[PDB]
Amino acid sequence: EGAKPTLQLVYQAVQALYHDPDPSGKERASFWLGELQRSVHAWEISDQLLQIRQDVESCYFAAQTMKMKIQTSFYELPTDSHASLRDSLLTHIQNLKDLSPVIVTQLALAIADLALQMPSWKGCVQTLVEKYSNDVTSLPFLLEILTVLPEEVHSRSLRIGANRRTEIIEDLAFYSSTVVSLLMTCVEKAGTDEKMLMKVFRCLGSWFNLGVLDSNFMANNKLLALLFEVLQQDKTSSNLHEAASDCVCSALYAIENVETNLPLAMQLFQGVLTLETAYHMAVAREDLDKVLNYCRIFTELCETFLEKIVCTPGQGLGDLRTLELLLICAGHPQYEVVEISFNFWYRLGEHLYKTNDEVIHGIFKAYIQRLLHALARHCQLEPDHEGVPEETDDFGEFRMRVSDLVKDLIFLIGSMECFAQLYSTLKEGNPPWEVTEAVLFIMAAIAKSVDPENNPTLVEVLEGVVRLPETVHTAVRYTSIELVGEMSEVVDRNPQFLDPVLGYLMKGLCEKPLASAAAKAIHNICSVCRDHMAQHFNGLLEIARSLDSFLLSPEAAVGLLKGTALVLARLPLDKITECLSELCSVQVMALKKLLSQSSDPTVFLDRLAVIFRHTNPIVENGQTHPCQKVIQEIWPVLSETLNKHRADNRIVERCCRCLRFAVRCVGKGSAALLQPLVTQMVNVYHVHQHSCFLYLGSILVDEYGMEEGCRQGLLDMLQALCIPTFQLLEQQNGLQNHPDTVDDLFRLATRFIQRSPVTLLRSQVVIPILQWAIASTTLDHRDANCSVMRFLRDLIHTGVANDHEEDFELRKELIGQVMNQLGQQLVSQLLHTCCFCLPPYTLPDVAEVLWEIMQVDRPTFCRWLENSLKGLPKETVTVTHKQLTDFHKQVTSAEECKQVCWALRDFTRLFR
């Protein structure tokens, strides 16, 4: 025998899962039931719970458990028992077909997943239909099985091979005639049952999505006529409407090429056009369910025929009546309707942009302005709105979505023509405030893209904005400020408007809800007009000093400092270093105050960061850098602040971020900070392993790696930082638990291998780094994997790069040692992670590493790759001999790195 859980124990656990008075008692039962599902005991327990049929809770748990075991643990079943499990599942769904629909889907999903993994069940669709089609009570669950079976063909949670999946799809296509014939019988029998038609529609759309239905046979098929028949009738409920809408969208989306499926395309095209009457009927009854459904059908129709709309507009399947349907939907007062079609308008603009033909553009010009006219009305705030427009709720994100869409479609109208059009509608009619606000919002979207040569109509709009009194609505003042920020180029070309614009932005800067928008606009004027801004610099510094007392958001304050730093860099070298110590002291003194106290230096660290980041003056003739002097004044308080909050990863992160831009700004200068910073970095990293010290070290190596006097100190820093790093990675699941450490470690190693490779390759710490690099390729992490692959790529490239250099033969020899001891292991680990461990996003990075290995020694790579292919688990025909052979041929006989990537895509696809 053996220890097994008993039926009484699981029934008591299932009851406790739903009905335990102690709320912690049901999470205690949930944990144990989860342990049961992942155990070998779950097979028999689920079967017996489904045979007893005690209640809905126990039967649902058993059905879900059966599904999970079949899709995750099918190897636990002996092949001898596959047929017994199928018969049991078919028996269970028969007995429980009326107990609960949610139980039936789980059993249907189990039957589907079982068939997909049981090739001995040949023609399962045929056996299922000619066993249950004659019983009207068995049709509901028969359709459920036939609905979820195509869905599970591409289930990520199943991991069937690409070769097996091709067998499945062409076997399901062979029986597509019988499932279509079953659906026609399902509408002849009980065709008035609304629930029956929904099951017929969901099954039809599922087989459309799989792409196995006959196009010409479905074109002349009554199922498609019934589909549009119910979408015309007003009496159809919301459930049947959604089922029919999804199926029409599935049929339209199933047409990937309009000429191959021309008879079907014409039938669908004619069908949706007849739904316009039903659309207006749905709008009159305020049935927002159907309205959104029709807009999805309309949007998908234009998506399916987007090629014909652009190629032959106004003729045949390019008939512009399709766009007229979308413009009708754009007229609906609810903005949730028009935003359904926003993706199509992007594609239309993208395709119209490709065809560099202004004659084709002119065909659609009217349709875009007609759409833009509707989008401007949707952006209108309510007439009783209080303050500035929201930018974080549903209506705020919609306005930002419209702003991006108008920027991408404005070329079809002409930015200059559309800008003056919106501005002319503002003078006449005495518009309400919410209308003037929305029109100003659209104008701000296209202001950056209008040619600033036609000054008259442009410079007079800017002139009218600064003359706005404070009596105007807050939202109108808010949007007008952002418009000025977008018109920074018209100010640079007409410099006489600088003072009126700066003055107007000053007033909004001194108001609370306009402070952020005014700081953003001031920043835009600073970066664009930084030439003739030396006069207004003194005023900017005054704002930079008393910056903290302005009710500015952290982003607005940083952006305001960025603008002041840009105009400062254009000043003479004397005035730069003079004003820089002042602007930093107001942040330095505040940092000293925090050392005598909540005390959160994040704000003042970020303010020092943005100052160093954008203070890049033209230093020539061997002059001293103005920021170097300020770095030595700033260093002690930074080191003091860093040592206090050394345990807080967030504050340390902002400290190193400020130190990053400080070193970047000065460059090889400020070498005095090398010894005290590196010393503090190693000491703090010994107790608290913040990965940002590895990144900060990479900046030092990137900035001082080429100077021979620093290569030893940097190598000592690397050997020092690697001791606590390896202990962090040697822990169980250390790679998965510390991915940021893996990321920043090979950022440091990459900067080392490209600034001083001979120093690293001839050291002792390069051996553990190489071993961790090969081990880190298994880590499923976007930033970590990109950093590791980049290191391996540049490490191997060292034996090829700069063949003109004096030390080329030494690098070639040093890389040959790495190739001999680790070359075969690297190719095998790279092939292993691509097929089993990593998602497809890593393939271009892996391909670049494989490409570099072929550059160093191509014939030896052919041998290493042939070995890794032979010793590869060719099982999920998982990998045929021709597929192994073609892969080795495509990689080794590749002339570009792209060919290695394409070979990885095809080969790696076989394992998922």
Next chain:
Amino acid sequence: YYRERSRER
């Protein structure tokens, strides 16, 4: 969110 790195080259 507070962690910021430099982009690729």
